Scaffold this active site. Structure first.
Site, mmCIF file in Angstrom:
data_model
loop_
_atom_site.group_PDB
_atom_site.id
_atom_site.type_symbol
_atom_site.label_atom_id
_atom_site.label_comp_id
_atom_site.label_asym_id
_atom_site.label_seq_id
_atom_site.Cartn_x
_atom_site.Cartn_y
_atom_site.Cartn_z
ATOM 1 N N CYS A 38 -26.752 24.055 -0.806
ATOM 2 C CA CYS A 38 -27.085 22.913 0.120
ATOM 3 C C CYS A 38 -27.270 21.395 -0.236
ATOM 4 O O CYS A 38 -26.841 21.118 -1.070
ATOM 5 C CB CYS A 38 -28.838 23.216 -0.830
ATOM 6 S SG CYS A 38 -29.823 24.766 -0.164
ATOM 7 N N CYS A 42 -33.727 20.900 -0.401
ATOM 8 C CA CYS A 42 -34.073 22.104 0.183
ATOM 9 C C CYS A 42 -35.396 22.060 -0.372
ATOM 10 O O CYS A 42 -36.088 22.901 -1.512
ATOM 11 C CB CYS A 42 -33.139 22.869 -0.521
ATOM 12 S SG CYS A 42 -33.545 24.547 0.567
ATOM 13 N N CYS A 69 -26.499 26.573 3.616
ATOM 14 C CA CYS A 69 -28.390 27.192 4.152
ATOM 15 C C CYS A 69 -28.643 26.622 5.326
ATOM 16 O O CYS A 69 -28.546 26.300 5.735
ATOM 17 C CB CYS A 69 -28.925 26.382 2.841
ATOM 18 S SG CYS A 69 -30.828 26.231 2.731
ATOM 19 N N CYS A 72 -30.308 23.733 5.252
ATOM 20 C CA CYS A 72 -30.371 22.085 4.588
ATOM 21 C C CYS A 72 -28.948 21.222 5.322
ATOM 22 O O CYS A 72 -28.509 20.727 5.755
ATOM 23 C CB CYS A 72 -29.862 22.669 2.869
ATOM 24 S SG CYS A 72 -31.046 22.518 2.030
HETATM 25 ZN ZN ZN Z 1 -31.428 24.813 1.304
#
Ligand code: ZN
Length: 92
Positions: A38, A42, A69, A72
Site C-alpha cells: 500500500c 490505506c 492493494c 491504494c
Molecule cells: Zn491498502
C-alpha cells in the site's frame, strides 16, 4: 536533506495513521498477513503496524513477492457498482 530526527517504524505508522494521501514515492507499507502492499493512505480499517513493514516503493514490495492493494496502489475501489446476480450468459 541529510537529516530527519527519528525515522523509527513508530512515525512510519504516524505518517501512515495520519492517512497521508500524497506519500506515493515517499514509501510503501506491506501487511504480510494478506500479502498486499500500500501507500500510507490505506483508508480501509487499518491492519496493525505489527503485521506491517515499510519500503521505498511497490517494486521493493514486488521484491517481497506481494500484490498491489485494491484501494491504494491502482486505486481499484468497487463500492457503488452493482453486485449483479452472478450466473454467466445473460443475452435476454
Ligand atoms: Zn491498502
Amino acid at each position: 536533506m541529510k537529516k530527519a530526527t527519528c525515522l523509527t517504524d513508530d512515525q512510519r505508522w504516524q505518517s501512515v495513521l495520519a492517512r497521508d494521501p500524497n506519500a506515493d514515492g515517499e514509501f510503501v507499507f506491506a501487511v504480510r498477513t494478506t500479502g498486499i502492499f500500500c501507500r500510507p493512505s490505506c483508508r480501509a480499517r487499518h491492519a496493525l503496524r505489527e503485521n506491517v513493514s515499510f519500503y521505498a516503493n511497490a517494486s521493493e514490495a514486488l521484491a517481497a513477492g506481494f500484490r498491489p492493494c485494491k484501494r491504494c496502489q491502482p486505486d481499484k475501489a468497487n463500492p457503488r457498482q452493482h453486485r449483479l446476480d452472478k450466473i454467466t450468459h445473460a443475452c435476454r
